[PDB]
């Protein structure tokens, strides 16, 4: 149903692949356990932060 | 915008899972989907246009 934003699926989650990172607990949970994730306490390293806005074409595209 | 032999659009095609293997996930499964938080988090208060090239650009990371 529609209560979500758009997301695409194409077919598969994954093909000869993975859906994000499919590997051991590191350390710990991730959910409530270290507030300001996304700004108010940005990490070091952990996503690709390439750039600051206009994801190309709208959405993706280069 | 492609159209030939194994696309780019074969990677960007986890779009569906990059959210929705958390909050439809952690409460069914442990914490191994996602090793990282950041990736999905991005949509906040933060970047709402980084997340959906990050499923190309650096599935993992």
Known sequence: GSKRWNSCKQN????????????????????????????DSQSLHDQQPHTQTASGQALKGD | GSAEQEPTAEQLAQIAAE??????????????????????????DDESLRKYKEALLGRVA
Not at chain 1, 14 to 21: F, K, L, Q, T, W
Not at chain 2, 27 to 44: C, G, H, R, S, V
């Open chain 2, 19 to 44: 959210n929705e293997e958390d909050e439809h996930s952690v409460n069914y499964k442990p914490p191994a989907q996602k090793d990282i938080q950041e990736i999905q988090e991005l949509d906040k």
């Open chain 1, 12 to 39: 598969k989650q994954g093909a000869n692949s993975r859906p994000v990172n499919q590997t051991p607990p590191p350390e710990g949970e991730k959910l409530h356990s270290d507030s300001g994730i996304s700004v």
